[model samples]
Target: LLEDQMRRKLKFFFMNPCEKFWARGRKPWKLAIQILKIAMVTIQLVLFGLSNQMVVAFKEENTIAFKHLFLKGYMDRMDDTYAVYTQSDVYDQLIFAVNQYLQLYNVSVGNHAYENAMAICQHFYKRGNIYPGNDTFDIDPEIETECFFVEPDEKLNLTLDFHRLLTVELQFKLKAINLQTVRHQELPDCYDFTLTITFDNKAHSGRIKISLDNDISIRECKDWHVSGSINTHYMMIFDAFVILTCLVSLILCIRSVIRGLQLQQEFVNFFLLHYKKEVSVSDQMEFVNGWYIMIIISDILTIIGSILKMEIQAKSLTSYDVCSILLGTSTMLVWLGVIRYLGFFAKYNLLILTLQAALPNVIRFCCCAAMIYLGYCFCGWIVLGPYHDKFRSLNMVSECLFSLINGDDMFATFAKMQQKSYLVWLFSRIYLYSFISLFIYMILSLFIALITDTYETIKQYQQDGFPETELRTFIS
Candidate 1:
């Protein structure tokens, strides 16, 4: 009988009084709709995730393939070998790769541009032995160079004068076209590929640096269009349904929250008039149905995420990361809302209680700890930055400290120090030791203790019942 009274008091928090008249003894409509919405949103997220995977996978593969095809020899050495090349060696290999790529495609460098090739005539000594059993050879000076231009159909029979050649540039264009069977869209129709080779003939290590510029557009899908494909049309229909469902969910939550607000006001008056007790703001807030807030947020995100997913599927946009984040977060929140229903069980309610009760204290503790943590990050970045790769930058230092707090990569992080000076080394040792001991031993322990305290308090309340207050006693 008391449970019936409790239901009567809380019924308006979830559903309208008129809902029963319309449904005619049906179970709660909002719960059914929420279940359906969760299923639909999860399915939509999975489909979009797979579609995004394809888009990402294709673009990455094509980028690597394009580089490999054009910069063949250099890419090979870059991957499997660490052998550095001399200026002449790098130039010759690049020139050879260009000629090979052009020949493969039945295209060649235009003859009119042959004059642009840098050339130099040289006279070098040639050894000649005139007599047998002679240890000395006559030095015959010769004037010859391998800097001649060849025809378009023939091999580019030329050699770079590494001594005189300071810079060499090669430019070409190719159509790196691919038909994405999923979306029926082309990747890049064509793009310009430029290579600039710089030679350093310094007194020390003479080497070359090869730079490549490939003009692929955003997500490697230039001039992308959907062209009214059947799959896109089907996807749009489902996305429209998803948007409609999200809109319904949003409307339901907005209405529920509004009703809850009205109830908060009406209940305050009821309690004041009948029980002669005034409800505080903190007590009034409990009547507002926090689950509806979560639902409202998830609904808004799902609406926007669905629209973005439709645009991506139709090739109207290439913002995969943004759309993925939107959809992913929305789906995760919706799934997390399932925990609200689980809270209906008294045994399962502790998690929800502990989370909400501990949140404020946990956040405050973290804020206090963050000041000390940031102090360490700055000190490490400034002091040990030059000696340690992990502390090379501010973000890196923060990540390293966070990792250290978690006791990860400890040996590698400690062992990779350059130890440029004893002073910096000693400072680094003190910094790391202090940070590890403070955060791991003290701050982390305190943080856990805060949650443990909240959990024990909640458990006590569960056992002996919550403290008697005007609002809670009125509800009871």
Candidate 2:
């Protein structure tokens, strides 16, 4: 296909690649700019690919980490060394260990491995507000597990670490009175390392095989910390390139803002430049402006987060265990910035018009539906609340309603609360019927009506070139 375009460009007797380097009237700067653009784009792609190539190599680290923790990629088809990896699919999973054997448990929700992370804090740390000077913490043997929360420090302690595993660090402390300075056997590759807990009882010489850490190690298994990347030159350059690209985007935004200002500095000017009839031009401007702002904000947040993450002053946050939050949020915001402007450069079109036209009605519909939804929520809460069951709160009521609306068994929720009283069953029936009548048949139909009705008007506006001075007086 490219060859054909080349031929067309060469002005071959029948093939008119008429605009050759010489034939296209000698404009050198245009080609220079094109070349620069092509080069920049190519550089971006090359850098992205190079950095991502290690994506697998990076993932290999997780596989190794998981393997050590009985998480993944290990098979017991014929060997005992690999048998401990029986839960290979559980790689990067969070589980608690207790007793003298290799038994692990998910704190809650059925060995959930909920956090799907590395580090010992997940299991032994009893968090519910730790005091600043509180040297001693509790691991209440009777407390329920599944207590994962973000910023677990503010009554929450969650996984703030970034990679979604894998490991290279070792740290330890001594406890026994007569023990010599404990020593660490140099670990190999953050893999195959273990927390060898040798009980004096020969029959109980069980070992906890934990992933090795490159930066941390244990003197002995007496006190254990299971120790814990995206550091590459091309990636650093790629980030630099992205930061540069953001600057360029800023320049483009300046131009866009300037053009927008010229077109519509006020309501009158907005109506003038847009269709003579106000076609929600101010709304369009704001929507576009919001993304530009979002792009800027996301970029700024990500940049600040990344910068702070690298600082020694704030890198101190790692001691308080906040590095994961910084790293995870920074990475997420960068992705947000990268994806912020999906369609800003395009001119208006069918979908945009349809979306804009239907937006007001959609909002109204949602509000109306929420009223109905709330009605069901309230009724369920009141009717079923007395029994202390699923409908105990609005949230639970919402869940019950959603299940009733979807899935095969509409009456399952009705039957659940029916165990104690008929009031729940009756409310469920009414709620189900109401949703079918209002949400399914009535409210949704209005959306289709808006789209289909507005679509024809938009099509006419397009066919007529959407001329200025156009009026939508006839629109309902």
Candidate 3:
């Protein structure tokens, strides 16, 4: 009898439509999980976008740096070394060790190698005649083979000092190799030299094999084997298409912003008519919503501008071209509208006034103008004098400017005497001050002021007695 009753209950639970449908209703836990998933996805997307942008910027900046530090043919002497060295097991081991070190430290191997190589190069340059087989030594095999081998001569012990010099010289050579790879279209030609070194780690003896090639063809022919004429033609076609797309997008965004502004103006006028004497709570909410929509539209334009700027920065789109100018101006205008709205809203409350309201506009204007100007100059120079050998040509100038903007102080050391003395220093100071004082402090203060103003406005409007006629007008 108990089993029969249990079976009936199970059947009812499974077949009853109400019981099955109960789980379909919204649950707090489920909603929360959905929201959490959305938030996580948004965060990941934002982080990925930022990281990708940063990596692109980093690669381009470093390429420019390599060009500046090591001009054409700078690594011609070490080309052979790079070619043979890269092919050896020692190079792989070194890369592995460096990568491991970076992983442990949570840093980039490229960054670590760059710093270490530059330091060693500077040291090598300071010590003149460190070359072997020269007047410095009669029969020093260490110097003769670029400090790879231990000398048979007993002048110096094969201690850590000996290895240190070898390692430092090797590191210096590697810097040249890296620069060559980054900048040159073809590799350097040199002889290949190989050696072996033994080190005792605790009780175990380990051997490392090192090789050097006189001519380093760091350039992979497979990547550049295409016909030069074909490449030039393809590049021209690709650039033309990109320019057209940018122009079309810019026109669409401008139209959108204009339409949005018109709608906003109409909404404001409607609100003003209804709440002429005193703002109602409902009226305030309406105005806030309108402002939010306008801001959102402006934000969308800002995003478009950012994308256009990135394209120009990457050299994927021609800089200072008509498309760039139009897009940049439109972006600046979007932000200008945003700032104006912020200012108007800020006036409603004195408590929430922030520097950001005043600063982002100014910063946006300056940054956009600077970027546009730089882009224009670069594109113009390339077009007018494609064969120009001037260091201050458009390409180099823009590269240096971007490097300075990216927090690389290398240009500060290389700026013209007058520029360094006056303009560069002044600009740097202004940038630092603006970042701290205007952008950070003012904007935050303004947001607070806005909230306070809104609340106060609502309270004052509420406290004031409203007539039946006014209430009727507001309701309508």
Candidate 4:
């Protein structure tokens, strides 16, 4: 009967053909939903993929495809490429360049200053990235004999956060690469990257690309920076795509809300209509409308995120943080919708059952484990305080004890405790072993028992007929 009702509901969703509850139409509502979801997934994947741009990852695979994007930071992209030199990055580049010329330029033509100067100038010349004027130093004056290098108090900060104002799909190939090195250029290998910014879409005519090719050189580059860029035109086009995506998502959200209201109304009506029958109305209604609610919330969040992600190029600190937060958060929600939708057709309904059915038992066991976890935390702190490095405070000791259960290697903590007193070692041993007993032998057993017990109880209730009142939620 319930299955029949679902089939009938699906019909009502599509045609609404009659003037009555169920009607007829040509296009099914489910198809509209699937179409909208496909757009959502496409745009979402694009956003995630665009996050990687610090290094030119010319995958020998194709997504000759899409872009205009997740990522830890907004504005974390390259105009050509972000060449921010950390102390390590700066030190490495200078040493590599100077050494290259230094080894090549023997003491002949031999002013020491001239050779260092030659390396330094070559560093500036080969790539127009770093300027030498006021750039500070920590190198010795001895090394500076040719380069006019400055000896240092400390390493100065050199920040050149390369980024663009908009987002797009970048197809980067090392142009003018008519030379082959002994080493092949894949990702981790550095290139003297003069990124040619292409403005052309599919139709290549009148593609006004000029010398925006910023010669951002990564000398024998390590893995690219923690960043990526976007073109202005690209952002506009992407905005159009995302706007349409958000609009469709908006439509779906509204529809889901309406569906939820209808479900609520249906539940009420079902209860009243069967007011005197031996029907378990409350029990039967469990999780009947949750997916609809979830879809609404997820879609709403995606829309909000899409709109804010556009502001990422504004370089506003607030925009960066908000853009990251909204997109990161919405991705999870969107994926939840994806998972739930996929599970809907599987017929097992394990996704729904896992979330809806496990709440009480899950919370109960968590509480039990939490209390014991806290106790173990404090016990480790108190009994093992003489060894203060590992047991310095609540958090540290908590980590040490947490290591025992969730911690990968906790046996090491015993070394310190064992040194002072075997008494401390003995106590730690008792604590760990007891925890294993209670947690594994006891707590884990209860959780598995709880799940199977719920399944059997529900199955038993369904198999055996019950009174109108005996049938409660989860029991029926």
**lDDT leader:** 1
Local distance difference test, each candidate? 0.64, 0.41, 0.37, 0.46
**lDDT tens digits, residue span 1-476, model 2:** 53344334323221112134435566444224323433443454454334334333433443343334432334433223321222331223322222101233422212212122222332222333334387854333332223222211111123422111222122222111111111222111121122221111111122224442222221223343333300112234544554455455546555656654553344344345544545456444542445445445544543453454345222222231353344344344434433322232245445566666677778877787778777877776776677646667789778866665544465555455544466655665776576656666765677788779888887788677664422222111
Ranking the candidates on TM-score from highest down gives 1, 4, 2, 3
Query: Candidate 1 on 64-95: residue-level lDDT in tens?
Result: 55445546464542453223366556655656
The 10-residue segment with the lowest total lDDT in model 4: 63-72
Evaluated against the true structure, the overall lDDT of model 4 is: 0.46
* Higher-ranked by TM-score: 1 or 4: 1
> Local error of candidate 3 at 223, Å?
15
Model 1 ranges off by over 4 Å: 1-7, 10-25, 75-97, 106-233, 272-279
Give the top-scoring candidate (TM-score).
1
User: Regarding lDDT, does 2 or 3 come out ahead?
Assistant: 2
> TM-score of model 2 relative to the true fold?
0.44
TM-score attained by model 4 = 0.51
Encode model 4's per-residue lDDT on 139-255: one tens digit a residue.
222211112332211123222211111111111222222112213322223333332222211221322221123333333322333325111125546655765766676686576
- The residue-level lDDT of candidate 1 at 374 comes to 85
- The Cα RMSD of model 2 versus the native structure comes to 16.5
Model 2 weakest 10-residue run by lDDT? 196-205
TM-scores of all models? 0.72, 0.44, 0.23, 0.51
